[PDB]
Structures are given as C-alpha cells and as structure tokens.
Amino acid sequence: AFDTYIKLDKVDGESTDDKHKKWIEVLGFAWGAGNECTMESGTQGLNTGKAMMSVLRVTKWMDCASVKLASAAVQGQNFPTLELEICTQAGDKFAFCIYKFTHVAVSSYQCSGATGGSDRPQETIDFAYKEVTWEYVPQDQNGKAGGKIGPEGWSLITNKKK
Template identity: 35%
Template sequence: MAVDMFMKIDGIDGESTDDQHKGWIELVSISHGVTQPTSGASGTGGRTGGRADFEPFTAMKEIDKGTPDLNIKCAKGEHIPKIEVHLCEAAGDKHIFMKYTMENIIVQAVMPTCSKGDIKPIETVSFAYGKIKWEYTELGQDGKPGGSTDRTWNLETNKQD
C-alpha cells in the first residue's frame, strides 16, 4: 500500500492541500524508535532491563512556510504543546491507519539538505517529547477501517498512561 504522511504542529502552519489535512505539513519520511537497554544474564539467569530509550521523532519534509518557525523554536528551545502525525492510504478514501500524538515537545534539530538538480530542498527535523501516543487502526481487505488499538507512554513519569 502506498502511504501519505502529514504532520500538524501547534502554532506552525504547513502547505498541504489534502482534503483531510489542509494546512498540515506533508512528510517524505518519518523515523522513531524505542529501545530497551539490557545487561547480560544476571546471577538468576535472566536479563535485566532499565529505563527505555526513546529516540527523537524524526520527520523529513520539503522546506516550506513552517521552516523559519521550526528554526526559531529550535534556537530558542521553545516548547510545542502538541504534534500529530497521520499515516494514510495514498489512494481511495485515504483512511488513516496510524497516528502518533506527542506532547511537551522541543525541536532538537532542523537540518536542510539540497543537492544540485534537486526539484525542492528537503529538511530533516527531530523532536524530543515528554509523552507519545501510538494509535493503529486496522484496514480490512475492503480498505475500510476496523478496530483500533492505542497506547500512551509518559517519558516524564516513565509510565504507561
């Protein structure tokens, strides 16, 4: 399935003209990860885990009208209350099958990249966050949305909400 991705950042407008995501930022790619550091086997034979490491949420996008604001927020270390990212089917009814919602965010980095001959420069933006919610909606064989599952992790309390 081909995928379209959109991001809404509180206080920063994008240029999307998509019916469901007007004014959002269109994304080229995203990456995000959670890892659990473990030690070798303990005296009881089991591995021990620690506090999970949450990688920054990184989005690649074309440079757009939100670029100056992202750079200023990064430079000032200003908090962003909320960011939403939607992953949608690229064709048909464009059902949203994955949502990421982050709260208490700081822009960690804004890194533009441009090469000779590029149609439009892109930039990679990394976000550190205090809370993240993952919400997945199943899409049936007919492409219609089914049941959904969501989970939230609060990095500030190191607990599931």
C-alpha cells in the same frame, strides 16, 4: 501509499488534502524505543532496567513552516503537541497510524540543497518530546477500515505507561 502528515500548534504547513489542511507534508519519520535488556547470561530474571525512547526524525521539503522550524531550533521553543499521521493512499485515505507527542521541541534543524536536479531543497528535523501514543488501525481487504488498536503510549516524566 503511506502519505505522512504532521501537525504543530500554531505552525501552518502547506498541505492541501481535505483531512490535513495546512498540515506539514512529510516524507519519512523514523522513530524508536526500547529498554536496556542485556543478554546477561548470569542473571536469573530478565532485568529490563530502564525505558527509553528516541527523537523523531522528520524529513520534508522546504515550505512555509521552515522559518518557524528554523526559529524553533535556536529558540528552544516549547510546543504542547505534535501529531503524526500516516494515511492510506487507497481505501479511504484514513490514518492507519496516529502518533501523538506532548511537550515537544525542535532539537535540531538541518538544511541542504541538491543544487540542480530534484526540485525543492530538503530539510531534516529532530523533534524532542516528553510523552507520546501509538494508535494503529487495520484495513479491510474490502477497502474499508477496521477496529482501532488500543491507543497506548508512555511518559518520560512518570516512567509509566499511556
């Protein structure tokens, strides 16, 4: 259920499934946005102010991407595009949620090792970006998919939509 993959330009991960070959296998993502809307209690309009977005926080094991992720950090390396993709365990293994970032960087890379229990050390990566898109897809109780829900998004270079 909710198997998550993520793609970086010229950065081979280790995945194996048909639709995500050499992608990076990821556990959790965590991501957020929201504006500066106060509870005011004195102003007539709402007053949304400015828009804002959060880094994406990826969790995953060590793989073949580690070293590049490690270097990316201290290198301030610019990527054109990061694609996040969560795909259904059942149904048709399709992506019911397709995220898309543009102008991405690794803002932090962390590493740590349980020691003697769970296999594979675990890393946590923070991906800073400029632009992004949501895209969601429902699933027919009959197993199959349904219509895709209008790909929308936002840009921190323009402070406009999509």
